[PDB]
Design a protein around this ligand. Structure first.
Ligand SMILES: *[C@@H]1O[C@H](CO)[C@@H](O[C@@H]2O[C@H](CO)[C@@H](O[C@@H]3O[C@H](CO[C@H]4O[C@H](CO[C@H]5O[C@H](CO)[C@@H](O)[C@H](O)[C@@H]5O)[C@@H](O)[C@H](O[C@H]5O[C@H](CO)[C@@H](O)[C@H](O)[C@@H]5O)[C@@H]4O)[C@@H](O)[C@H](O[C@H]4O[C@H](CO)[C@@H](O)[C@H](O)[C@@H]4O[C@H]4O[C@H](CO)[C@@H](O)[C@H](O)[C@@H]4O)[C@@H]3O)[C@H](O)[C@H]2NC(C)=O)[C@H](O)[C@H]1NC(C)=O
Ligand SMILES: *[C@@H]1O[C@H](CO)[C@@H](O[C@H]2O[C@H](CO)[C@@H](O)[C@H](O)[C@H]2NC(C)=O)[C@H](O)[C@H]1NC(C)=O
Ligand SMILES: [Cl-]
Ligand SMILES: [Cl-]
Lengths: 337, 335
């Protein structure tokens, strides 16, 4: 019983069991309300789906009232378990503390204790919160996001019909100083569990040397429309557990983005991964802006196509297209000027 | 002997302008920025807006811009000599450096980005259209002004005799400027007269100049006196940088370049942090922490997202350098 065996059951032509999901703090109400406006205007009014909001602290009454008014579909508020937002018993907190203090000015969120709990949460726990149990699909939405174009079709229905497992917009190279031992830990896991490496994996996106080293490319997780059953699979559960035991979420600053990406690219047949070239999106500081004129004009996009990050050198659109055998847009090189 | 400040004090309505370097492909982001500037300060305190571009502007672009801006607008194209390889830079070596760094750091493989950094460092302040002004306010596309600004900022700078004003500060990625600090210190060693006796070196270094802590003012937002850049100290500093080759052999940004100059060549009380101006340039915010300022100016940002005192920001280093008292809850930004 393979990884795909846990996922294919979610592929009848009924309405998919899906939700939007947001991990946010009370101090981010204004940015969150702004993201809701985009989601509501660009797609939720047309194809309504429940929205789940999670917080490590309780939501204020003002926050809930404001969100309930802004969202036209059903909203659900949940707080996460202490066990999913605390140091595991095997982690040396004095050591973690030293690492943070030392890295405070060395890289973004280097000195942040809470950022690491967030990365660990998005890597191994959000997908098993009680509020997501009844769903097969989720669409992660962060605060301060923009949806630049109309989306005139149900995306969850589309993923279900086309049997896609993981969908993304932006991709980028990670700062290695943030994940020095993530690749080694991940490669050791594969060597130990060969059955988990899909024979038609997307290793080419993650590495230029057949897996010897990581090229640092990953899908930018702030935007994800994927199948919850991937994370619930034995393969991923065991992968997370291994990472959790190694200590990188706290001894380094492992993000959930490279973690989710390494898993998706290695545990799935590559044709289960999908790039939404048609969804206009902005998460500071990068844009995904539809390059196709018809798609751009038909969906009234509000972005500057020339600012699409996809084919910029530091993005990983080129690596993704080549690994998937996708034909790149004619003027893709213009983005490398 | 005339000093750096002697070139600036005579400039103390001000002859000021907004200035933007933009490409035709960023029209929607620019119009958005314009709407913000108009709504938060320009209709109340109008000042001319200068738009620069290394290529000619499209008619559609100019038309849209002319009508979106309430004050006078001016369009200018950049001199070819302010946007091309100087004759002493080895282009194949630069080409190799770019091809190599392409996937290594943001803009690593970009040729245009380097000409842009070099332009903001040594040439925008000498463009024909800026000659008549003493002050400028740099505005980039895709910006937000979160709050109303109820005073004329240029006038304020003038009356308070401030030379360089900023909002966001950050630590630079060292891989883009490996030899910038040594080059700058060698310049100061050879030109001790340009180092102001009461400078802000402590903002740039934790060890009195031995090493660069990488802190810099984020140049996307600047309200300053053009006479600092037109001073002999800066002209000679930029020329030294230009001949060293870092704009092309590394990836020297104008932000650290402007910052090193401002922090070493001026008395520190000539630098000013606008704690009251709400601003966003992807992906960092400056959101007024003071309650009265926030409410009175109808700010639209999340205060808890203010970048100023976050670890990777240089707000702490800045306040400490100027002897400014940090807000009581500054540590919460480091959680
Ligand atoms: C959980 O994690 C914690 C945290 O890491 C573990 O504790 C740490 O354990 C390591 C061992 O693995 C200890 O290392 C030894 O450190 C001493 C020096 O100790 C001083 O410096 C420390 C480092 O300072 C830097 O970092 C801090 C903060 O990050 C900065 O502020 C500084 O500026 C520095 O950058 C510092 O942390 C220590 O502070 C502690 O003690 C002081 C009092 O002294 C207190 O005020 C503090 O609050 C705090 O309590 C301290 O100041 C080294 O000397 C040791 O090196 C010897 O051994 C090495 C090999 O083992 C060898 O390579 C060295 O050369 C050296 O050996 C020499 O001497 C030998 C004996 O004579 C000779 O035989 C040999 O030939 C050679 O000549 C060693 O590196 C940490 O100190 C310790 N930290 C703390 C806070 O306890 C903890 O073990 C983990 N818990 C578990 C269950 O695993
Ligand atoms: C300009 O830069 C190029 C590229 O670095 C130099 O080309 C040489 O570089 C190496 C010698 O140091 C060797 O690889 C070759 O001799 C040659 N390589 C190339 C690019 O073909 C070149 O010498 C530099 N020119 C000057 C005047 O220094
Ligand atoms: Cl930070
Ligand atoms: Cl790039």
């Amino acid at each position: 019983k393979t990884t795909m065996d846990y996922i294919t059951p979610s592929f009848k032509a009924g309405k998919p069991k899906a939700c939007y999901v947001t991990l946010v703090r009370n101090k981010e109400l204004k940015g969150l309300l702004s993201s809701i406006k985009y989601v509501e205007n660009k797609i939720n009014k047309k194809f309504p789906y429940p929205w789940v909001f999670l917080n490590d602290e309780p939501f204020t009454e003002e926050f809930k009232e404001a969100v309930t008014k802004a969202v036209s579909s059903e909203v659900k508020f949940g707080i996460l378990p202490k066990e999913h937002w605390s140091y595991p018993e095997w982690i040396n907190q004095t050591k973690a503390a030293e690492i943070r203090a030392d890295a405070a000015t060395k890289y973004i969120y280097g000195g942040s204790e809470s950022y690491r709990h967030m990365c660990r949460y998005q890597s191994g726990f959000f997908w098993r919160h009680e509020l997501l149990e009844e769903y097969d699909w989720y669409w992660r939405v962060e605060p301060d996001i923009k949806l630049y174009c109309d989306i005139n079709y149900d995306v969850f229905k589309w993923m279900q019909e086309n049997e896609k497992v993981y969908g993304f917009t932006v991709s980028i190279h990670e700062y290695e100083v943030t994940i020095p031992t993530l690749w080694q830990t991940s490669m050791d896991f594969i060597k130990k569990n060969p059955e988990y490496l899909d024979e038609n994996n997307l290793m080419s996106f993650l590495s230029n040397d057949n897996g010897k080293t990581y090229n640092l490319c990953h899908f930018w997780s702030n935007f994800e429309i994927a199948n919850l059953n991937l994370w619930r699979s034995p393969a991923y559960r065991e992968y997370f557990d291994t990472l959790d035991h190694q200590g990188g979420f706290f001894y380094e600053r492992w993000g959930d983005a490279p973690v989710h990406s390494i898993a998706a690219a290695l545990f799935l047949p590559k044709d289960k991964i999908h790039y939404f070239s048609d969804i206009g999106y902005h998460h500071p500081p990068y844009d995904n802006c539809p390059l196709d004129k018809e798609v751009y004009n038909s969906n009234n996009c509000e972005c500057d196509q020339g600012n699409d990050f996809t084919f910029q050198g530091y993005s990983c659109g080129k690596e993704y297209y080549d690994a998937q055998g996708l034909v790149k847009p004619k003027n893709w090189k213009k983005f490398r000027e």
